[PDB]
């Protein structure tokens, strides 16, 4: 074992991106580059330094002198952002990189959408109160969210996930706030309060419905 | 051409897994077959291949000794016996063709921990029209601590699949993880015609049909 690629590189969309393996190994084995995209499978894009398998786009290439693997993205498109794996067999083993996470900028924004739910009439009569708000179909995948008791910030009690790409290049993401019944009544309203590249979105909901 | 893992789930450390993959749709006695795994937020990390034939062939430094991969050419089967298990083990298993990667199946995921399982409470989102565009309305699903990943949901025993959206779990300070579907249907359409969250935590063995009712 041994191979060392970068973790990770930025790229404008439609210039060039080279990514770098670079252990041992190479030195006569011969490389594989696997792309993954996240919640997704692995897939060979390229095998053997420069071959490519049928349906990946012509513009991916790679190249490899000894030290080191190159997998190269000619015309950089929003897709190409995922996860790239360098593979090589040493003798009797196989070796992964550490994988290099892409970046592709600069995309188009795209404004949050926010679901807010208030808590089930069927939880509270199981003596919980979970708040549940769903932020979809944003980007860049970077979001902060606050909640609040009527307009008092609350602190303790908010699960939030970090944001995850989505089919359409977009991200989602999720917070949870989780609440006594009494809390849940003894308000006029809660709030998700998500902010987004200094845009805000705030999204209400009271016990009296 | 298709790799199906099966036999992953939560084990406690210093228990045994047998992992198998079923494949088709190719020639499976001409093929190195292998494991790769990859722990959660990690890399890919290699297991162990093995030769059309039986010899096989190494394994990663970090299961020898524990881990065994055998294959049955008549049932076109792939196999990986885990022994001695620790946390360390915790990672989704996938199965893949050939010496170059070419093939990977969807994986199935294994979990090494003291803590024992917990099937989910279940509790409907009730439509709302608020932040949906248009004459529809958004209904849900609320699937709130389970433990481990994963848990799949289906909407009206799969008749409805435009407009889902299930989001990805959180992990809670707790440890235990929810999370929520969503559904987007005509408001035309809110009663006449119902609307069923179909939740099914395989590792507590619980399912939960729950019906999603207007408030």
């Known amino acids: 074992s041994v191979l060392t690629q970068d973790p990770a590189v930025s790229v404008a969309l439609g210039q060039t991106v080279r990514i770098t393996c670079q252990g041992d190994s190479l030195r006569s084995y011969y490389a594989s580059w696997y792309q993954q995209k996240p919640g997704q499978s692995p897939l060979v894009v390229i095998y053997?330094?420069?071959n490519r398998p049928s349906g990946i786009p012509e513009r991916f290439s790679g190249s490899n002198s000894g030290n080191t693997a190159t997998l190269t993205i000619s015309e950089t498109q929003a897709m190409d952002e995922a996860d790239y794996y360098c593979?090589?067999?040493?003798?009797?083993?196989?070796?992964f990189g550490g994988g290099t996470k892409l970046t592709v900028l600069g995309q188009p924004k795209a404004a949050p959408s926010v679901t807010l739910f208030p808590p089930s009439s069927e939880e509270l009569q199981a003596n919980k109160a979970t708040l549940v708000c769903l932020i979809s179909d944003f980007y860049p995948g970077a979001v902060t969210v606050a909640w609040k008791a009527d307009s008092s910030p609350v602190k303790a009690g908010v699960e939030t996930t970090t944001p995850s790409k989505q089919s359409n290049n977009k991200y989602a993401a999720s917070s949870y706030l989780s609440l006594t019944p009494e809390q849940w009544k003894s308000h006029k309203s809660y709030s998700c309060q998500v902010t987004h590249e200094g845009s805000t979105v705030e999204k209400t909901v009271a016990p009296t419905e | 051409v298709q790799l199906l893992e099966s036999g992953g789930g939560l084990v406690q450390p210093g228990g045994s897994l047998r992992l198998s993959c079923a494949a088709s749709g190719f020639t499976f006695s001409w093929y190195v077959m292998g494991w790769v795994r990859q722990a959660p937020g990690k890399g890919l990390e290699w297991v162990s291949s093995?030769?059309?034939?039986?010899?096989?062939?190494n394994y990663a430094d970090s299961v020898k000794g524990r881990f065994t991969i055998s294959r049955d050419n008549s049932k076109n089967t792939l196999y990986l016996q885990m022994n001695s298990l620790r946390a360390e083990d915790t990672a989704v298993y996938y199965c893949?063709?050939?010496?170059?990667?070419?093939?990977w199946g969807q994986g199935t995921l294994v979990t090494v921990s003291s803590a024992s399982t917990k099937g989910p409470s279940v509790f409907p989102l009730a439509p709302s029209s608020k932040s949906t565009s248009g004459g529809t309305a958004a209904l849900g699903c609320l699937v709130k601590d389970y433990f481990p990943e994963p848990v799949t949901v289906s909407w009206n025993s799969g008749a409805l699949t435009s407009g889902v959206h299930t989001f990805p779990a959180v992990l809670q300070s707790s440890g235990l993880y929810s999370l929520s579907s969503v559904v987007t249907v005509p408001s035309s359409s809110l009663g006449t015609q119902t609307y069923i969250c179909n939740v099914n935590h395989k590792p507590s063995n619980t399912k939960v049909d729950k019906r999603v009712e207007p408030k």
């Open positions: 893949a063709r050939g010496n170059y990667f070419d093939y």
């Open positions: 593979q090589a067999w040493d003798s009797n083993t196989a070796v």
């Open positions: 053997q330094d420069t």
């Open positions: 093995i030769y059309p034939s039986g010899g096989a062939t």
